[PDB]
Amino acid sequence: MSTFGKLFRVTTYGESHCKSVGCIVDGVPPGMSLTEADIQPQLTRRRPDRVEIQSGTEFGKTLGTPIAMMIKNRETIGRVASGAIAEKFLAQNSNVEIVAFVTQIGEIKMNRDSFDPEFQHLLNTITREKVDSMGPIRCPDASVAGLMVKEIEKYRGNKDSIGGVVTCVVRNLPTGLGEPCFDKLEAMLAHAMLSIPASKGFEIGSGFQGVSVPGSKHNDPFYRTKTNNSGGVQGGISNGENIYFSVPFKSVRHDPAVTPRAIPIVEAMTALVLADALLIQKARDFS
Amino acid sequence: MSTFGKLFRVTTYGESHCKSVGCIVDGVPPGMSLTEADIQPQLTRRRPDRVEIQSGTEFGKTLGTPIAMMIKNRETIGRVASGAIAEKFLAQNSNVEIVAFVTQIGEIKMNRDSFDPEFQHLLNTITREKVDSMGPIRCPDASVAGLMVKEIEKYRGNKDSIGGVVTCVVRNLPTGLGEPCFDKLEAMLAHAMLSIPASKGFEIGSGFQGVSVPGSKHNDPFYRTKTNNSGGVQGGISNGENIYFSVPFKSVRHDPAVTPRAIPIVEAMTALVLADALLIQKARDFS
Amino acid sequence: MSTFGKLFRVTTYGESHCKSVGCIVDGVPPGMSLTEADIQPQLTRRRPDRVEIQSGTEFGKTLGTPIAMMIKNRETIGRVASGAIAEKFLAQNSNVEIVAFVTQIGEIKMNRDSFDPEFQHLLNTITREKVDSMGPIRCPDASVAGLMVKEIEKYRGNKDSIGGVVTCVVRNLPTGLGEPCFDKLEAMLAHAMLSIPASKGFEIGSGFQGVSVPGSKHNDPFYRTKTNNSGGVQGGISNGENIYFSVPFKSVRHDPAVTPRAIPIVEAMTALVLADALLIQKARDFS
Amino acid sequence: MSTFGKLFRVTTYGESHCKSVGCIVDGVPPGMSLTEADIQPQLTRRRPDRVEIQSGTEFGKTLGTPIAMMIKNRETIGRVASGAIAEKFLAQNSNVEIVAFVTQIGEIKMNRDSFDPEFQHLLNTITREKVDSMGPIRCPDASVAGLMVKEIEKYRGNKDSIGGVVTCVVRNLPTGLGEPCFDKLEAMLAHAMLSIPASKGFEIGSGFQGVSVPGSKHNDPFYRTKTNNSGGVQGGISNGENIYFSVPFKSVRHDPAVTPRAIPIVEAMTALVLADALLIQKARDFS
């Protein structure tokens, strides 16, 4: 249905032609600074439309009760709005960084080979500000960014559309997140990503491409130190390495800016998943 | 944790070195024929080890209470065991057919282009019996099956391992299955598949490869009638077309038969997902 | 947290001093007539304050998507609002009748002995309209109603308050509702009732008072046909007899109209529980 | 269904005439000492029948994986077994004490008035060992215990049965447990207690009897310091005062030792609820 999460929960609402769209976020801890200004930046980024908090805060801080947010005039705004709260909760209680970006438009692919030190260096350093500095295409590889824009213009000229891939990295994630055997972190992430409109998949770490590479190269300490081929999970829980994953989107009514526009949704869904996982993990760290 | 499902539920248990492994299946309807013989075939297929029902049946039929199954001496047997029940429930109350098979070992790829009429014809006709007739490699494409076996033998010679992709088709699925906006059928499937040990991904329909193909070709009525490019879902619910999806597996302790051995787990997880979805859909078909 | 239900779900929001209060109702079937006028009657009854539907309907009918409702300026309105939807869903798909009423204020008790044919006759015939015809006290027993009003006035004179008991009957409930062993119908009802502010308990059927009566009298076919002593449940599922139960409320800031004002909340919570149970039961009636 | 709990979870199985009965307990923290000897005492107490741990431990300690327990030859053993784990988890991580006892058999009532200093003193001091020292009747009030035994013998002579009330106290509970607005601690407890076979109710603190007492006496600081009239909850969360509640049981096949035999089930259900609540509360204490 339209509730997501176990302890950090969002319930959404809203169709195209209705009075409002929004969500209710439940399980946010009391005492955290939160106003509309913490939420608008990511909502503005949905174009490479306002938001008022109805409840759950007082004098700029959260009460620990349900936080309803509404925007006047299905729709993914509630996801992005709720993810902005998750993101702040994670920034404070961890310095987690979540950055998504375009790695494919149509036939044009950024190299994102998990064994490639340059790709790894990009995962280590990329930031939202850098992603946005590229223009609306939001691909931080200048050897292909302009070819992607041209692909988009080829299809726009033909009154056609084409899909792409969004890749996301998460840094500074604590160890132990995820809940085997069925709610392993990668499974919670996949569930999240496949729910996004026009998503057709999910892969983590070495993914589909690493099927071509022998196990020895995935695991050996040198290949020149070993890369992050797991995408930050072992046995279904975070190992403190970077999480990275990719999601393909379909274009089709035509787009064809589906892919760059999907960055904040991917980021939001990631934050919701990681905020839930962090709460669940603190439940049993105590115990 | 180790419970999967909402209305058709399985809770599993078991490590490598413990007294037994098993599961409890909850939400099976009363009155269905079920004995150990309905469960053994798929468990035997885990090699290209017994099982006794502890509860939930009487005189060969289900009571509607929890069905505990145990096998003396984490482990995925409980998944396969519970999936055999799901599969029978779906066969009776639908004629659903679920068939998984190998489409990649290492560098060797079966063509599985969603726009290719031959691939579509294979999705329409493939059966378990045909999959198993190929040998342990379980790839029903003789142009590549023997090259896959040779890839496996190359890596076995090197005391190495290598991964692969399992592709799964579901036929005769009723319309309306899946629960938007967050428990869309493809999201329930992805969650299921990413929980399988050594899984690194999930894609449905046109997937990652269809990112290279314009929207016009995905959607036009002719390309020669339109193929199943969605993989059987629209707006997150089944449309009565074939469901098909693929999952990549890592090899690494080395294998390298991880991929063909994963077929029954993929089938089992698929059946659990579809049995749950079918129950949830009947809840509101009534209403 | 602030979500209630499994398949018929409500998530609520709202504190005393916030911009609005409301809820999101998820799992309502498509095609049912619903506008604000179906919701106002029960909300008006919270005094022995408006409501606008934000989403989930079109041209007076439900879409099957989340129905957000909001009232400008914790709070129990969202419960009552969502329960009005549940109630309509149950009236249509069953002719279920839910009627709550006051049976105790302070020291003044209406006789509600399960073995008493008059009490049983009242359970069989009582209606909301009859309950409200009594005045704000909402106790349909004139031998005690006026003594209850006088009790209230005694305590109001003393700038004090006092509690009471609300009793609720449900008629025409289909058989098979409830989900043993842990979500038995009486357990779902108890969970619901103990969540209401100022509730201190829950009892069904013969309850606390029937502890004094031997088993033979509970079960014998004559005592003059056997009464409904179970309160409509056997083995945790509805048996098609009347459901009846009682809830005590505390008075304390003072009231002392807590008890009569709680009638619509009790009715609403009952409807939410029974609408969920009915959906879950149809899930496996099919199967 | 037959799963109970959110983070501390038990799934049970077993009918009268099946191969075994048992449960799977999920969410127990790793590193805790646990063997069969921690579980047998409470199971023996089910008579005023063995148990083997199948999984989840190694070298006498918990692994953090699912703990399956089985007893060869519905049934409530799995509840009691799982509750023994919950109880140990709570004893270690809190010094919580849970003590249940008989307060009514048939017409014979122990005084349990919340305003009565003697009742309060008993809640403060009662222990299991003291409860069991009374004989199988398990009522620690000698002014009525022998009258209760005689009531039981009156009905046993008549080949009849009669019910009773079990009262339970919890001491040293940390503050903040429970999850408003719908999973308030008293609602989680009520849900738990109404699921026990033959349970017909639940009341906490002043309960049904305190409906007769004005609000001033419930709340005033002196009445001689104020008693615990809330039963240890305010706004649906624990306030660090003693929790106490009572549950009525029906006798009917006849018993009539249903009531004293129900003590360990009540204790077990209490422990499961409080272990879950404690985990959920630690989730957001962190945050």
UniProtKB/Swiss-Prot annotation, chains A, B, C, D:
InterPro entries: Chorismate_synth (IPR000453), Chorismate_synth_AroC_sf (IPR035904), Chorismate_synthase_CS (IPR020541). One of its GO terms (biological process) is aromatic amino acid family biosynthetic process. The keyword Ribonucleoprotein does not apply. One of its GO terms (cellular component) is cytoplasm. GO terms for molecular function: chorismate synthase activity; FMN binding; FMN reductase (NADPH) activity; riboflavin reductase (NADPH) activity. The keyword Oxidoreductase applies. Disruption phenotype: Impairs sporulation, probably by blocking the biosynthesis of aromatic amino acids. It catalyses: 5-O-(1-carboxyvinyl)-3-phosphoshikimate = chorismate + phosphate; FMNH2 + NADP(+) = FMN + NADPH + 2 H(+). The modification N-acetylserine is found at S2. Pathway: Metabolic intermediate biosynthesis; chorismate biosynthesis; chorismate from D-erythrose 4-phosphate and phosphoenolpyruvate: step 7/7. Gene3D superfamilies: Chorismate synthase AroC. The active site is at H17, D255. Induction: By amino acid starvation. Expression is increased in response to DNA replication stress. Keywords: Acetylation, Amino-acid biosynthesis, Aromatic amino acid biosynthesis, Flavoprotein, FMN, Lyase, Oxidoreductase, Stress response. PROSITE patterns: CHORISMATE_SYNTHASE_1 (PS00787), CHORISMATE_SYNTHASE_2 (PS00788), CHORISMATE_SYNTHASE_3 (PS00789). NCBIfam families: aroC (TIGR00033), PRK05382.1 (NF003793). Belongs to the chorismate synthase family. Homotetramer. Present with 2310 molecules/cell in log phase SD medium. PANTHER family: CHORISMATE SYNTHASE. This is Chorismate synthase ARO2. It comes from Saccharomyces cerevisiae (strain ATCC 204508 / S288c) (Baker's yeast).
